[PDB]
Structure 1
Amino acid sequence: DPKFQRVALSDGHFIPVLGFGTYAPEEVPKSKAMEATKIAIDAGFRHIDSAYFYKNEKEVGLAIRSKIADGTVKREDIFYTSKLWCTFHRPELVRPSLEDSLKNLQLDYVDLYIIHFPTALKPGVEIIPTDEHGKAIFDTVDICATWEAMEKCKDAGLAKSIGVSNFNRRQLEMILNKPGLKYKPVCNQVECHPYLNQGKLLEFCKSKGIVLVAYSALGSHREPEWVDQSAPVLLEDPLIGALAKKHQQTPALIALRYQLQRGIVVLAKSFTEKRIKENIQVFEFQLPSEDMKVIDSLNRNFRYVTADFAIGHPNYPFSDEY
């Protein structure tokens, strides 16, 4: 059943090539993630993407633990991802964060734990702490030291795999190039879609054996307001439409299947039963090379997530060409 297909990770673990995305806008109750994750699992999703940041880990864990108690899946059929938030980059905060997430999940490990952004922020009770205004408070933590703390999470059997998110090439190289590296990041999970296809990052990751995992592959939720206001809308792109018509597909399906054909692992968030069943048909067709080269033309280097809160940070990722 091709919908259960996985790509090899450099550490000998396997990751489903399509993942269920669980972030929703703050106004959306975390229970929807719960209801949506159950439905996604029934549909055949096995790879579930979350993060400390989405504050839905107790909800997703109930879902996953629901799907296990009724025979649907075994723990080892599920591939759960979570992410170290930037307020815990400090080595001594890394395990307790992940154990915190396990305690919430009521699971024994996560299959992938990754650094969410390379930009550390000031620890404490705010998720993104900001001053007497706007601006996040940066903290200065060496990414390699965060990395070592993550390697120790792997060694502890807490996370089967470890990786990063939103790193540029320079920042991957820093980890790669770490004197004494035990484990390489198995993936770099980054925004990826026809408007920001990531063709130089992707080539780089591959040459290094790192899996690129794409988020906002369907065009993001387009928040807040100002982005929704002027960002092009992926799923309505007239050329992605032409392509869906030609293959009798939907826009979403074209955009998902574009990523898979580049050996990207692609995430897809829907809390809509029907679009959940739809997204998993991505495996029911292919695009010829000539269609991939026409989608290539849509690239404009536009970002749905500039993560503005880390502008002026030492390690803000998006300044370099890639």
Structure 2
Amino acid sequence: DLSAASHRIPLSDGNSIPIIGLGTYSEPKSTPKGACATSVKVAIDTGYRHIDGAYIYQNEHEVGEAIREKIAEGKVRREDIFYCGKLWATNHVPEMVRPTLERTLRVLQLDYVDLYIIHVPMAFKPGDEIYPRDENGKWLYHKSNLCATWEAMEACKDAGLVKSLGVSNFNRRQLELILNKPGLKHKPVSNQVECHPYFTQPKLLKFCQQHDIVITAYSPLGTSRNPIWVNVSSPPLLKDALLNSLGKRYNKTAAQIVLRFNIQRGVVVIPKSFNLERIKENFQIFDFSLTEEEMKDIEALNKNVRFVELLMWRDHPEYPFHDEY
């Protein structure tokens, strides 16, 4: 079913997605220039064939540098690599969608991306700032139309600029808005959301599975626990007693147990690491499996509590986390 050499799963539009990818968000401040490029190259050498990135991570040029180098030396063909990029909240105006994607293609110096997704269901004020606020720190919200944004996304696939379309941080209602759109041409094939044993997304997973939407687990290792985004008070996922106990049983780390858990139930995982040893460690998840009982015990770790709550945006008309799922 899944091996280091062959671990792609089907998307509803006929394409396929490698079940593990390398995440590439890293705080610009505390990240050396070049760390991203080096990690993407190491990842590709290790066997990763999926890279998840975003223009607003400020390192897409490094991602592109790395991918193009490996293609040029014959390590991979372009068709072997799956790159996912993301449309930010300040770029939701339908007229801006294609120019925004074209900017990413030019930065990557590639002809298309494999997956392009709406990063969040919330629109912010368009401009030179990804986090638009007034002097009082009030979040400058744009009153926006998700369906109109989606239509603009559909035009990008129509033009050949992206193979697959998806979304991120969408709840059931928001997914329904799109799925029910008048004259829908291309349904979202993916929803990228926080997913791991402390937040296993049972309701959203069920819903997506019923609509042939694949979940991609972001922060699948429980985040880097940065207090800006994460509630540092919470117990760190990788210190969990059961996950560590299961680790000893298989001579795997809690991280490897956590990744295996999600892929084993058909959830894509995109752990980020810019560390040589940990990039390799995270990929070694195809030489063991978890028993039905172990899967059940891990799933039971579910706390229905998020590490990434985005409370700064809780009042936005399109804040996704009020609803149950």
Same fold (TM over 0.5): yes
Q: Is 1:158 the equivalent of 2:155?
A: no
Q: In structure 1, what residue type is equivalent to 2:22?
A: F
SS of structure 2 residue aligned to 1:83: strand
Q: Is 1:301 the equivalent of 2:319?
A: no
**Could you say which residue in structure 2 is the equivalent of 1:255?**
258
List per-residue Cα deviations over 1:132-160 (Å, max 9, x = no partner). Answer: 13332110110011000000110011111
In terms of fraction of residues, the more helix-rich structure is 1
**Could you say which residue in structure 2 is the equivalent of 1:21?**
23
Match of 2:111 among 105, 108, 112: 108
Query: What CA distance in whole angstroms lies between the structure 2 residues aligned with 1:297 and 1:230?
Result: 21
Matching of residues 258-273 of structure 1 within 5 Å: 258-273=261-276
Match of 2:85 among 57, 79, 82: 82
List per-residue Cα deviations over 1:201-249 (Å, max 9, x = no partner). Answer: 0000000100000011101011125835312201111111011111111
Q: In structure 2, what residue type is equivalent to 1:55?
A: Q
Q: CA deviation at 1:108?
A: 0.4
Task: Please report the TM-score for the alignment, with normalisation by the length of structure 2.
Answer: 0.97
Q: In structure 2, what residue type is equivalent to 1:136?
A: W
List per-residue Cα deviations over 1:147-190 (Å, max 9, x = no partner). Answer: 00000110011111000000000100110000110000000000
SS of structure 2 residue aligned to 1:229: coil
Does structure 2 conserve the Cα–Cα contact (< 8 Å) formed by 1:135 and 1:309?
Answer: no
Does structure 1 conserve the Cα–Cα contact (< 8 Å) formed by 2:229 and 2:310?
Answer: no
Matching of residues 177-196 of structure 1 within 5 Å: 177-196=180-199
Task: Please report the TM-score for the alignment, with normalisation by the length of structure 1.
Answer: 0.97
Q: Is 1:143 the equivalent of 2:135?
A: no
SS of structure 2 residue aligned to 1:140: coil
Unmatched runs of 5 consecutive residues or more in structure 1: none
Does structure 1 conserve the Cα–Cα contact (< 8 Å) formed by 2:229 and 2:308?
Answer: no
**Could you say which residue in structure 2 is the equivalent of 1:276?**
279
Unmatched runs of 5 consecutive residues or more in structure 2: none
Per the alignment, do residues 203 and 67 of structure 1 end up closer, same or farther by CA in structure 2, a change over 3 Å counting? same
Q: CA deviation at 1:29?
A: 3.2
Q: CA deviation at 1:286?
A: 0.4
Q: CA deviation at 1:26?
A: 2.5
Matching of residues 196-235 of structure 1 within 5 Å: 196-224=199-227, 227=230, 229-235=232-238
Query: What CA distance in whole angstroms lies between the structure 1 residues aligned with 2:32 and 2:122?
Result: 28
**Could you say which residue in structure 2 is the equivalent of 1:243?**
246
Does structure 1 conserve the Cα–Cα contact (< 8 Å) formed by 2:9 and 2:18?
Answer: yes
Q: CA deviation at 1:130?
A: 1.0
Q: Is 1:95 the equivalent of 2:88?
A: no
Query: What CA distance in whole angstroms lies between the structure 1 residues aligned with 2:287 and 2:321?
Result: 35
Identity of aligned residues (%): 59
Query: What CA distance in whole angstroms lies between the structure 1 residues aligned with 2:147 and 2:275?
Result: 39
Query: What CA distance in whole angstroms lies between the structure 1 residues aligned with 2:113 and 2:229?
Result: 35
Does structure 1 conserve the Cα–Cα contact (< 8 Å) formed by 2:230 and 2:309?
Answer: no
**Could you say which residue in structure 2 is the equivalent of 1:320?**
323
Does structure 1 conserve the Cα–Cα contact (< 8 Å) formed by 2:12 and 2:189?
Answer: yes
Query: What CA distance in whole angstroms lies between the structure 2 residues aligned with 1:61 and 1:133?
Result: 38
Q: In structure 1, what residue type is equivalent to 2:217?
A: A
Query: What CA distance in whole angstroms lies between the structure 2 residues aligned with 1:118 and 1:225?
Result: 20
Instruction: Count residues in correspondence.
Output: 322
